Design an enzyme around this catalytic site. Structure first.
Site, PDB file in Angstrom:
ATOM      1  N   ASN A 194      -6.612  33.493  24.756  1.00 19.07           N
ATOM      2  CA  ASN A 194      -6.538  33.109  23.366  1.00 19.07           C
ATOM      3  C   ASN A 194      -5.236  32.396  23.103  1.00 19.07           C
ATOM      4  O   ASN A 194      -4.161  32.937  23.356  1.00 19.07           O
ATOM      5  CB  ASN A 194      -6.744  34.327  22.466  1.00 19.07           C
ATOM      6  N   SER A 201      -3.251  34.522  20.412  1.00 18.41           N
ATOM      7  CA  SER A 201      -3.552  35.938  20.604  1.00 18.41           C
ATOM      8  C   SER A 201      -2.623  36.835  19.758  1.00 18.41           C
ATOM      9  O   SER A 201      -1.401  36.625  19.735  1.00 18.41           O
ATOM     10  CB  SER A 201      -3.438  36.279  22.084  1.00 18.41           C
ATOM     11  N   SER A 202      -3.215  37.761  19.004  1.00 19.61           N
ATOM     12  CA  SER A 202      -2.485  38.794  18.296  1.00 19.61           C
ATOM     13  C   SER A 202      -1.970  39.781  19.338  1.00 19.61           C
ATOM     14  O   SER A 202      -2.770  40.417  20.041  1.00 19.61           O
ATOM     15  CB  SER A 202      -3.450  39.552  17.376  1.00 19.61           C
ATOM     16  N   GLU A 247      -8.971  43.171  26.662  1.00 16.82           N
ATOM     17  CA  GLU A 247      -8.550  42.098  27.524  1.00 16.82           C
ATOM     18  C   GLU A 247      -8.390  42.536  28.954  1.00 16.82           C
ATOM     19  O   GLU A 247      -8.047  43.695  29.234  1.00 16.82           O
ATOM     20  CB  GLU A 247      -7.231  41.444  27.085  1.00 16.82           C
ATOM     21  N   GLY A 263      -7.743  42.671  20.786  1.00 13.64           N
ATOM     22  CA  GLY A 263      -9.037  42.880  21.331  1.00 13.64           C
ATOM     23  C   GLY A 263      -9.013  43.208  22.821  1.00 13.64           C
ATOM     24  O   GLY A 263      -8.053  42.973  23.477  1.00 13.64           O
ATOM     25  N   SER A 275     -10.626  39.850  23.307  1.00 16.02           N
ATOM     26  CA  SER A 275      -9.627  38.888  22.964  1.00 16.02           C
ATOM     27  C   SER A 275     -10.241  37.442  22.747  1.00 16.02           C
ATOM     28  O   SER A 275     -11.059  37.000  23.554  1.00 16.02           O
ATOM     29  CB  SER A 275      -8.559  38.847  24.072  1.00 16.02           C
ATOM     30  N   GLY A 276      -9.817  36.711  21.708  1.00 18.94           N
ATOM     31  CA  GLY A 276     -10.339  35.344  21.393  1.00 18.94           C
ATOM     32  C   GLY A 276     -11.688  35.290  20.644  1.00 18.94           C
ATOM     33  O   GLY A 276     -12.170  34.203  20.329  1.00 18.94           O
ATOM     34  N   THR A 294      -9.243  37.865  14.078  1.00 22.49           N
ATOM     35  CA  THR A 294      -8.135  37.509  13.250  1.00 22.49           C
ATOM     36  C   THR A 294      -8.534  36.400  12.263  1.00 22.49           C
ATOM     37  O   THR A 294      -8.059  36.385  11.115  1.00 22.49           O
ATOM     38  CB  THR A 294      -6.932  37.126  14.135  1.00 22.49           C
TER      39      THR A 294
HETATM   40  N1  LIG Z   1     -14.752  31.290  12.147  1.00 26.97           N
HETATM   41  C1  LIG Z   1     -13.971  30.436  12.895  1.00 26.97           C
HETATM   42  N2  LIG Z   1     -13.819  29.127  12.614  1.00 26.97           N
HETATM   43  C2  LIG Z   1     -13.062  28.259  13.291  1.00 26.97           C
HETATM   44  N3  LIG Z   1     -12.414  28.606  14.397  1.00 26.97           N
HETATM   45  C3  LIG Z   1     -12.446  29.942  14.786  1.00 26.97           C
HETATM   46  C4  LIG Z   1     -13.215  30.938  14.043  1.00 26.97           C
HETATM   47  N4  LIG Z   1     -13.105  32.141  14.659  1.00 26.97           N
HETATM   48  C5  LIG Z   1     -12.278  31.917  15.723  1.00 26.97           C
HETATM   49  N5  LIG Z   1     -11.886  30.628  15.783  1.00 26.97           N
HETATM   50  C6  LIG Z   1     -11.044  29.986  16.826  1.00 26.97           C
HETATM   51  O1  LIG Z   1     -10.877  30.858  17.979  1.00 26.97           O
HETATM   52  C7  LIG Z   1      -9.490  31.199  18.140  1.00 26.97           C
HETATM   53  C8  LIG Z   1      -9.442  32.705  18.482  1.00 26.97           C
HETATM   54  O2  LIG Z   1      -9.736  33.381  17.255  1.00 26.97           O
HETATM   55  P1  LIG Z   1      -8.959  34.690  16.772  1.00 26.97           P
HETATM   56  O3  LIG Z   1      -9.488  35.189  15.454  1.00 26.97           O
HETATM   57  O4  LIG Z   1      -7.521  34.347  16.894  1.00 26.97           O
HETATM   58  O5  LIG Z   1      -9.201  35.738  17.964  1.00 26.97           O
HETATM   59  P2  LIG Z   1      -9.094  37.366  18.081  1.00 26.97           P
HETATM   60  O6  LIG Z   1     -10.400  38.023  18.152  1.00 26.97           O
HETATM   61  O7  LIG Z   1      -8.397  37.415  19.418  1.00 26.97           O
HETATM   62  O8  LIG Z   1      -8.256  37.811  16.899  1.00 26.97           O
HETATM   63  C9  LIG Z   1      -8.842  30.799  16.801  1.00 26.97           C
HETATM   64  O9  LIG Z   1      -7.462  30.462  16.830  1.00 26.97           O
HETATM   65  C10 LIG Z   1      -9.655  29.587  16.367  1.00 26.97           C
HETATM   66  O10 LIG Z   1      -9.330  28.483  17.222  1.00 26.97           O
HETATM   67  O1  VO4 Z   2      -6.558  37.579  21.424  1.00 24.44           O
HETATM   68  V1  VO4 Z   2      -6.860  38.720  20.135  1.00 24.44           V
HETATM   69  O2  VO4 Z   2      -7.961  40.038  20.358  1.00 24.44           O
HETATM   70  O3  VO4 Z   2      -5.874  38.499  18.732  1.00 24.44           O
HETATM   71  O4  VO4 Z   2      -5.346  39.891  20.901  1.00 24.44           O
HETATM   72 MG   LIG Z   3      -6.122  38.306  16.705  1.00 29.00          MG
END
Ligand SMILES: Nc1ncnc2c1ncn2[C@@H]1O[C@H](COP(=O)(O)OP(=O)(O)O)[C@@H](O)[C@H]1O
Ligand code: VO4
Ligand SMILES: [Mg+2]
Ligand SMILES: Cc1ccc2c(c1)N=C1N(c3ccccc3)CC[C@@]1(O)C2=O
Ligand SMILES: [Mg+2]
Length: 703
Positions: free
Chosen positions: A224, A227-228, A450, A448, A179-180, A184
């Site tokens: 996160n 978080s999705s 968690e 992801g 997660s985070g 996404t």
């Molecule tokens: N390539 C990136 N550039 C800028 N910020 C990022 C990037 N990847 C992740 N983040 C930051 O980290 C947070 C968590 O990313 P996200 O893709 O939402 O997580 P997850 O793996 O849970 O889907 C985002 O909202 C953003 O703040």
């Molecule tokens: O925090 V993420 O892996 O989107 O659920």
């Molecule tokens: Mg996500």
């Protein structure tokens, strides 16, 4: 050509910066170094030590503060420093944990978050904006082979796209991460990129599908801020020519429990904060709204705000994206009525009456929900506290106590939210999927891995999906790879890469012997079952018997599962009820008579409202999850997979802060080093006879 011009935004933001004369001197040095542990109990914290002497089987090096010796067999040698920043780590001379980490460290310190690691891409979350996702960046990667350009999410995306075109074969981008970690954010880049390089209004709608899904489907967790809380497989659909013809979104089970309950510091779904924040003066009066602190579903966690996020401004972006996809003005209002009503339902307060049965003394929240849903409040009230059931064939009105009434009210709220979410996705797909596809590039963005203080049934299903996604990486990279060498007798001694999720997978989803989910199902249709007979049944089957299962001594209501990413303790409270997922028929009858045309579709459209049977019972949530997952997995098996391993730097959502143990645990459980070694030791390519390389039963195999 920006690729060759050191002055470009491309050279600035994607390439290793030119070292100086001081660095040159260090790079031509004859000295050799070792990564070592100052404290041997802390195996992930390393310093660099100069090798000062050697014997036939040992090195002696200096420590940062003394001198130490080490078997050459246990030595983690530092790469020549010319390798520091290298774009693909399969080029490293020394493939070991601190060397691989150090290379990621060097790149990250310069905001180089993408690095190849053999065949797959590693992405380490920056937790800040980096200017690498512009049209100019996109234009740059368009058409470039992977070794012509710097590691980027765009480059892996282009490669899938050209493979699709040249091979007439559907592709997938499987983006892994706790997660985070960035899954996404990277998914959205893959989409931006595919839409640009293969595009011809449809494009903008594909892009605008995301903010709607995120508003209703993402929330702040302690891991996160975005978080999705649902997973998705997104198909990018291409005509035979190779232009985008559309897209289709498969969404997987939403975490409906969050609507009614959030842990300390977390939030409900973004949409609730956005309505309350960004509604007009007349929205707020027509919907009977007030501030988050007024709603039980928003005022329990102690957090109503996310740092750096304007919910009012996000509300505007959600409405814009809804206008662009095609949600009509009456539809949007209906959507918000449902949002509002859910909040009003949350405020109903049941109390004990004369007898055991609940009463409603104050009917304000009940009347306000009924008004915005367009249902009859006297009917809804009756359906909540006195729902009718069959006892045999007899029709018996129950009178639910406070706890049962409150829990029935919760069930109706979660059904409204989950059904609205599926409706949103349905509506979106009708717009985006308007032509038959010839090909697809599928992109997978799950919740992801968690761990919280309290892990429940939702966490088990998330973590199992992540385990299955890791097994699928293991399968491609190592198992299938080596079976090819075997069916082609190519002189290959089999290697045990010691990465196997099978035992954990079987424990969770086994059918004979039954695994956790199968035993949950059994208990779920057993009329006398309780959360205590359930845990007992689990310990009975697995305790001191399955190597991945632990019965804790400190708790009678938890069990531990050893996942690829670590042990999680799961609390059994409410598992039978979550798995059965009940809703009183009398609630459904009440909402079937809604004067709102969106509300009415949620309760009458069988593709949203109907639930499958297994004999005399509705399908359990575990059985549905299992179905979605097997269907997902079978789709992937029809594709050529590309893997992006996203990697979180720390567990504080901070930029410029690589934490050693955090990052290395990910590199280990992801099998990143094993993945680099199969790349190096093995034979990537093979062609049926075509008309440091090898000849097989039907194929030449190279490197
Ligand atoms: N390539 C990136 N550039 C800028 N910020 C990022 C990037 N990847 C992740 N983040 C930051 O980290 C947070 C968590 O990313 P996200 O893709 O939402 O997580 P997850 O793996 O849970 O889907 C985002 O909202 C953003 O703040
Ligand atoms: O925090 V993420 O892996 O989107 O659920
Ligand atoms: Mg996500
Ligand atoms: C197949 C398959 C793929 C992906 C997923 C999935 C299922 N389930 C998931 N979650 C869930 C929530 C409540 C109960 C059960 C499961 C929530 C996230 C989820 O949508 C997911 O990432
Ligand atoms: Mg505990």
């Amino acid at each position: 050509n920006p690729i060759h011009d050191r002055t470009s935004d491309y050279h600035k933001y994607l390439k290793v910066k030119q070292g100086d004369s001081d660095l040159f001197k260090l790079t031509v040095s004859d000295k050799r170094y070792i990564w070592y542990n100052p404290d041997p109990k802390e195996r992930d914290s390393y310093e660099c030590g100069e090798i000062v002497s050697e014997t036939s089987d040992s090195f002696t090096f200096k420590t940062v503060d003394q001198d130490r010796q080490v078997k050459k067999d246990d030595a983690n040698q530092r790469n020549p420093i010319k390798f520091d920043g290298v774009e693909d780590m399969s080029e490293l001379s020394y493939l070991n944990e601190p060397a691989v980490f150090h290379n990621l460290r060097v790149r990250y310190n310069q905001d180089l978050i993408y690095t190849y690691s053999g065949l797959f891409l590693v992405a380490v979350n920056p937790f800040k904006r980096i200017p690498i996702y512009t049209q100019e960046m996109v234009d740059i990667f368009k058409g470039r082979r992977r070794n012509e350009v710097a590691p980027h999410i765009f480059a892996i995306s282009d490669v899938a796209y050209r493979s699709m075109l040249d091979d007439r074969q559907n592709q997938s981008l499987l983006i892994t991460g706790e997660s985070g970690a960035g899954k996404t954010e990277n998914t959205k880049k893959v989409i931006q990129y595919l839409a640009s390089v293969a595009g011809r209004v449809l494009e903008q709608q594909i892009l605008q599908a995301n903010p709607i899904l995120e508003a209703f489907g993402n929330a702040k967790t302690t891991r996160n801020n975005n978080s999705s809380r649902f997973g998705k497989f997104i198909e990018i659909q291409f005509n035979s020519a190779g232009f985008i013809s559309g897209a289709s979104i498969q969404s997987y089970l939403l975490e409906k429990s969050r609507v009614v309950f959030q842990s300390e510091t977390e939030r409900n779904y973004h949409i609730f904060y956005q309505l309350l924040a960004g509604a007009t003066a007349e929205e707020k009066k027509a919907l009977h709204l007030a501030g988050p602190e007024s709603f039980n579903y928003l005022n329990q966690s102690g957090c109503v705000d996310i740092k750096g996020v304007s919910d009012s401004e996000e509300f505007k972006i959600t409405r814009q994206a809804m206008d662009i996809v095609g949600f009509s003005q009456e539809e949007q209002m209906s959507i918000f009525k449902i949002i509002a009503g859910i909040l009003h339902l949350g405020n109903i307060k049941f109390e004990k009456g004369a007898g055991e049965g609940a009463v409603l003394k104050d009917k304000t929240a009940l009347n306000a929900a009924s008004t915005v849903f367009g249902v009859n409040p006297s009917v809804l009230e009756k359906a909540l506290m006195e729902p009718r059931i069959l006892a045999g064939r007899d029709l018996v009105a129950q009178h639910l106590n406070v706890e049962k009434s409150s829990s029935s009210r919760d069930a109706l709220v979660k059904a409204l939210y989950g059904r609205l979410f599926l409706w949103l996705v349905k509506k979106i797909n009708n717009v985006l999927c308007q032509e038959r596809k010839a090909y697809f590039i599928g992109v997978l963005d799950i919740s992801g891995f968690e761990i919280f203080k309290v892990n429940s049934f939702e966490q088990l299903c998330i973590n199992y999906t992540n385990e299955k996604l890791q097994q699928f990486f293991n399968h491609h990279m190592f198992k299938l790879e080596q079976e090819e060498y075997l069916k082609e007798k190519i002189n290959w001694t089999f290697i045990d890469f010691g990465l196997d999720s099978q035992a954990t997978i079987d424990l969770i989803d086994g059918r004979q012997p039954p695994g956790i989910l199968a035993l949950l199902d059994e208990q779920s249709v057993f009329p006398n079952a309780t959360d205590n007979t359930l845990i007992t049944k689990l310990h009975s089957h697995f305790s001191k018997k399955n190597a991945k299962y632990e019965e804790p001594r400190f708790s009678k209501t938890e069990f531990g599962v050893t996942h690829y990413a670590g042990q999680v303790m799961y609390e059994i409270q409410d598992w039978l009820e979550k798995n059965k997922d009940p809703l009183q028929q009398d609630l459904e009858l009440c909402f079937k008579d809604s004067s709102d045309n969106v509300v009415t579709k949620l309760f009458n459209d069988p593709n949203i409202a109907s639930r499958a049977k297994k004999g005399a019972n509705f399908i359990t949530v575990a059985a549905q999850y299992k179905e979605q997952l097997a269907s997902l997995m079978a789709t992937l098996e029809t594709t050529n997979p590309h893997f992006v391993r996203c990697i979180i730097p720390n567990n504080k959502q901070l930029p410029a802060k690589l934490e050693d143990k955090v990052v290395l645990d990910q590199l280990r459980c992801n099998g990143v080093l094993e993945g680099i070694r199969i790349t190096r030791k093995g034979f990537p390519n093979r062609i049926i006879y075509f008309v440091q390389y090898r000849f097989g039963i039907t194929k030449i195999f190279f490197r």
